[PDB]
Ligand binder design. Sequence first.
Ligand SMILES: COc1ccc(S(=O)(=O)Nc2ccc(NS(=O)(=O)c3ccc(OC)cc3)c3ccccc23)cc1
Length: 285
Amino acid sequence: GRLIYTAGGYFRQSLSYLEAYNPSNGTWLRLADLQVPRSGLAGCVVGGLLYAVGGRNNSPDGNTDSSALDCYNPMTNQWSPCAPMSVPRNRIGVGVIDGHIYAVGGSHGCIHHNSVERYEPERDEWHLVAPMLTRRIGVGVAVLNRLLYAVGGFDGTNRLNSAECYYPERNEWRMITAMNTIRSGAGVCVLHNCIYAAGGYDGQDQLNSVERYDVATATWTFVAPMKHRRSALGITVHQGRIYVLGGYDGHTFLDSVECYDPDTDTWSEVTRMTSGRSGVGVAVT
Ligand SMILES: COc1ccc(S(=O)(=O)Nc2ccc(NS(=O)(=O)c3ccc(OC)cc3)c3ccccc23)cc1
């Protein structure tokens, strides 16, 4: 009975929605609003708890990048504040390894981070780990074989097709094979033994293409393209399928949710959010 949760986002301004989708019956739940509206945040789950990490509050008055970390408990329907990160990180990537949340890249104003920090929920503390090789914002992050992958993004000058691999036991990064397509703001997840990068922005157009990295062969391969081009999309995996939610298509903030089935290699539109939005954090619990 797991749900896909979607937190925050952007439509005219940063949003406070926490909504959940139930793929078994196609219904949506409206849950407790975020304390502070945020977009460009990342969502992850550790031990049944949903965490909303980083992002930005883009409001009528002004804009503030967020160093915040907040914890949503589905049992109690309440957000609680956690220890903040060392720096604000808008357009952040995040992965979880062994119960620890990794906050990768992102921006603070015009500073494009290569730093990486790790959150320990048992102790409510962030600690810096080794920095990435490249500054990356709008970076997609996936965890496979207890390694953390940082894919694409924007370094401050160049939009990137490069990707790198973090080794927690050695505390070191290495560059891996570059993608076929430059992508910032892509959706990045892991399904079966592969990293998928879906959509994003190549510096000219929003993309519908989708590629996957097979770790055995160290090669990126195109798979079936989404129906909508999209960047700043949310992404998750649920019962063996990839779900992509929202994003910006070049003209509209999308309410479309597409599902990818790897056995048929096809995308289908399975629901719509209650309103169109980009830059959401998404996770499953
Ligand atoms: C068009 O208006 C927008 C206003 C706000 C927003 S957002 O949803 O609040 N966040 C973001 C905005 C941009 C990002 N990088 S990008 O590569 O996708 C991109 C780059 C250039 C573009 O065109 C010139 C469009 C998208 C984001 C990346 C990750 C997460 C959030 C991003 C989205 C759209």
